[PDB]
Amino acid sequence: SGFRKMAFPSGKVEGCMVQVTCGTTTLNGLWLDDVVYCPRHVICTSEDMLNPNYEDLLIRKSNHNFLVQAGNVQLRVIGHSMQNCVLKLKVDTANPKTPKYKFVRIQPGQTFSVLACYNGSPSGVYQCAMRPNFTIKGSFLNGSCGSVGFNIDYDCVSFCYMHHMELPTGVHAGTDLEGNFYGPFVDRQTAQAAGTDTTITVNVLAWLYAAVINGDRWFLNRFTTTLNDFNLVAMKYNYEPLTQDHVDILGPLSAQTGIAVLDMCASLKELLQNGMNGRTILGSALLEDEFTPFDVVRQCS
Amino acid sequence: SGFRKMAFPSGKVEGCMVQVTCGTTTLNGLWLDDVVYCPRHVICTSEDMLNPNYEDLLIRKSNHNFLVQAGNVQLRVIGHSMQNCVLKLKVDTANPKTPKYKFVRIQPGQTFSVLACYNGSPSGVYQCAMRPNFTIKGSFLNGSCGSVGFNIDYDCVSFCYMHHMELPTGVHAGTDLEGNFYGPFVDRQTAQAAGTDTTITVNVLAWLYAAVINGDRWFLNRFTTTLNDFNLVAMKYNYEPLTQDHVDILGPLSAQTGIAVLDMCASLKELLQNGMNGRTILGSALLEDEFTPFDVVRQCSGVTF
Numbered sequence: 001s002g003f004r005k006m007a008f009p010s011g012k013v014e015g016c017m018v019q020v021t022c023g024t025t026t027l028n029g030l031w032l033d034d035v036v037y038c039p040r041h042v043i044c045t046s047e048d049m050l051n052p053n054y055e056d057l058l059i060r061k062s063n064h065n066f067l068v069q070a071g072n073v074q075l076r077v078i079g080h081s082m083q084n085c086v087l088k089l090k091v092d093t094a095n096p097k098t099p100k101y102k103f104v105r106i107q108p109g110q111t112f113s114v115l116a117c118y119n120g121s122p123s124g125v126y127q128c129a130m131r132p133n134f135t136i137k138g139s140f141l142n143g144s145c146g147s148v149g150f151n152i153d154y155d156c157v158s159f160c161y162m163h164h165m166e167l168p169t170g171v172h173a174g175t176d177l178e179g180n181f182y183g184p185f186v187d188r189q190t191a192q193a194a195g196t197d198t199t200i201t202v203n204v205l206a207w208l209y210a211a212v213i214n215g216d217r218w219f220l221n222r223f224t225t226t227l228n229d230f231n232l233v234a235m236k237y238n239y240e241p242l243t244q245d246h247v248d249i250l251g252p253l254s255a256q257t258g259i260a261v262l263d264m265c266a267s268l269k270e271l272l273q274n275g276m277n278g279r280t281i282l283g284s285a286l287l288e289d290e291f292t293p294f295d296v297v298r299q300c301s
Numbered sequence: 302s303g304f305r306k307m308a309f310p311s312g313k314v315e316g317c318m319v320q321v322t323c324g325t326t327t328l329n330g331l332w333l334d335d336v337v338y339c340p341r342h343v344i345c346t347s348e349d350m351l352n353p354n355y356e357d358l359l360i361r362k363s364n365h366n367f368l369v370q371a372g373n374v375q376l377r378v379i380g381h382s383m384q385n386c387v388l389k390l391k392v393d394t395a396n397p398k399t400p401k402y403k404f405v406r407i408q409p410g411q412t413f414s415v416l417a418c419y420n421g422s423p424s425g426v427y428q429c430a431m432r433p434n435f436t437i438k439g440s441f442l443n444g445s446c447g448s449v450g451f452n453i454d455y456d457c458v459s460f461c462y463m464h465h466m467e468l469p470t471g472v473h474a475g476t477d478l479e480g481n482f483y484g485p486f487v488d489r490q491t492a493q494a495a496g497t498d499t500t501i502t503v504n505v506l507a508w509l510y511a512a513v514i515n516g517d518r519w520f521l522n523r524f525t526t527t528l529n530d531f532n533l534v535a536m537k538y539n540y541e542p543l544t545q546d547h548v549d550i551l552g553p554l555s556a557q558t559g560i561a562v563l564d565m566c567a568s569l570k571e572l573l574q575n576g577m578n579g580r581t582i583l584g585s586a587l588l589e590d591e592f593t594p595f596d597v598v599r600q601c602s603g604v605t606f
């Protein structure tokens with residue numbers, strides 16, 4: 001019993017974090033086999049952060065301009081290349097700790113663990129979600145760039161996020177491990193702002209099901225709703241639309257608990273109109289939306 | 302920026318987790334040097350639960366009654382002993398993945414990371430606190446027994462918890478790594494309840510300091526109360542007493558933010574009586590009490606391991 005913001009065990013990623021220095025900038029890199037991955041803005045300089053020309057900056061760099069440190073062992077760069085906004089540094093030594101891994105690009109709504117790192121060294125691990133506005137609400141300080149996000153379903157590490165910058169609202173932006181940004185963000189210091197965020201409705205519903213599975217009943221009601229009327233209610237609370245895919249996805253949790261999805265939808269409607277009234281659900285006083293249907297089953301079954 | 306429920310990196314503890322089996326019961330053990338630690342109720346069978354005799358049941362068992370699998374590789378047991386509620390199985394191989402560690406017993410209100418495991422395999426990690434009533438509000442399913450809680454300092458793992466059982470109210474109970482239970486519980490099948498739980502005042506204050514550092518300041522007020530005046534407000538609302546030592550520990554955060562502890566206490570007093578005005582603090586709609594003053598200093602400054 002119980003329900004926690006549960007991360008994956010970070011050991012497999014810890015063995016991959018190294019320290020990357022170019023010029024005056026030191027940030028984190030990800031060492032897999034004989035490649036170190038890191039944000040390409042490490043080759044940027046204090047004078048040209050607004051409109052760097054990355055192809056021009058990289059060709060001027062020699063392999064020796066990159067200091068890569070795995071613990072206290074210096075790793076020697078023997079080549080480099082750029083893939084979108086990720087820098088790939090070829091090193092002379094393969095990482096003996098490389099886990100079984102893949103690179104995956106996730107969709108808004110997906111969740112992942114983050115190994116927050118500084119100077120190639122791990123600080124802590126938390127759960128996070130791809131927000132609908134394609135930011136992530138992380139915990140990152142200066143020097144965290146290069147920190148990665150990942151899942152470890154079934155002994156295989158799925159890398160899905162590399163941290164590149166903090167936006168003016170205090171939330172965070174980054175790329176998949178192929179260098180493509182999540183959202184309309186760019187690795188420059190030009191004025192760019194997160195769109196209005198919204199609540200991940202299918203995740204809220206997944207979480208209310210987990211609440212039922214753990215013995216909470218008090219938010220339930222005798223009403224049901226249509227998909228269309230619930231979506232009309234959703235949009236008025238900045239909630240993501242609920243689709244038929246989402247309803248299908250909630251099928252198993254519906255069958256475990258005996259509550260039809262649209263019945264749970266009527267509950268969510270009521271909670272939005274009324275609030276908690278001094279109460280909690282699974283120890284929170286807000287509707288949680290960073291637990292997916294897959295997370296609930298993972299941690300309840 | 303940002304503030305999350307942050308666990309310690311779990312790599313050093315993952316390499317110590319092993320599967321222990323005794324009869325039909327399978328659970329997790331902690332392989333340190335050449336000893337494997339696990340809950341002593343692994344030698345109970347379902348007839349033994351009501352009132353088990355651990356002394357007797359252990360004498361009448363052989364070293365190879367204990368299947369110890371480190372992954373796919375079987376660890377040969379060469380001795381065994383009991384200490385309080387923990388089973389110590391000496392083995393023929395020192396764990397090459399043993400980190401620098403020690404055994405610590407934590408105080409109520411203090412936090413740790415839990416590495417939840419099933420069949421000797423780490424599946425999850427999360428942060429949680431030793432409640433004032435010596436339960437922990439964990440997330441554990443059948444098979445979780447033997448999962449461990451820990452803190453890290455520099456490069457030393459402080460093991461402070463081992464999971465033994467779940468109570469009827471869904472919260473969890475366990476021991477230190479010396480086998481002493483936290484709280485008034487026993488490792489047999491019986492009705493067990495804990496004293497009523499309370500809110501860790503000093504952690505709520507630490508958490509409000511975290512919100513201020515993160516620009517969340519709507520709850521701040523111009524007012525300052527006293528230790529005694531707050532402590533009566535605390536009793537009314539079932540908060541742990543706030544001591545001068547608590548005030549001292551919060552000193553760093555006081556200096557960094559410019560908000561004296563008894564100023565913040567006036568803010569906490571006002572939140573306790575007036576609710577939270579439909580507003581959030583650090584993305585929560587209640588008073589978070591599972592962040593110590595040190596946990597705040599860790600996320601907000603970037604302490605590394």
Ligand SMILES: *[C@](C)(O)C(=O)N(c1ccc2c(c1)oc1ccccc12)[C@@H](C(=O)N[C@@H](C)c1ccc(F)cc1)c1cccnc1
Nearest residue numbers: 027041044049140141142143144145164165166187188189
């Ligand atoms: C990284 C380097 O470790 C870091 O922490 N931050 C950062 C600094 C400089 C950056 C950057 C990110 O991204 C780029 C792109 C191009 C040129 C320079 C550069 C900082 C951070 O993001 N700071 C803000 C002010 C920022 C935004 C956009 C930008 F182009 C530059 C700087 C950081 C701080 C807190 C949490 N994460 C990252």
Ligand SMILES: *[C@](C)(O)C(=O)N(c1ccc2c(c1)oc1ccccc12)[C@@H](C(=O)N[C@@H](C)c1ccc(F)cc1)c1cccnc1
Nearest residue numbers: 328342345350441442443444445446465466467488489490
């Ligand atoms: C363990 C085996 O991994 C486990 O998950 N649980 C458990 C099972 C049997 C136990 C036990 C704990 O503690 C004892 C003591 C003495 C004899 C047997 C035995 C279960 C769990 O705690 N089940 C509860 C109902 C329980 C309590 C006390 C008891 F004597 C028997 C059973 C568990 C389930 C979820 C999370 N943690 C533990």
Ligand code: NA
Nearest residue numbers: 019021026119
């Ligand atoms: Na340096």
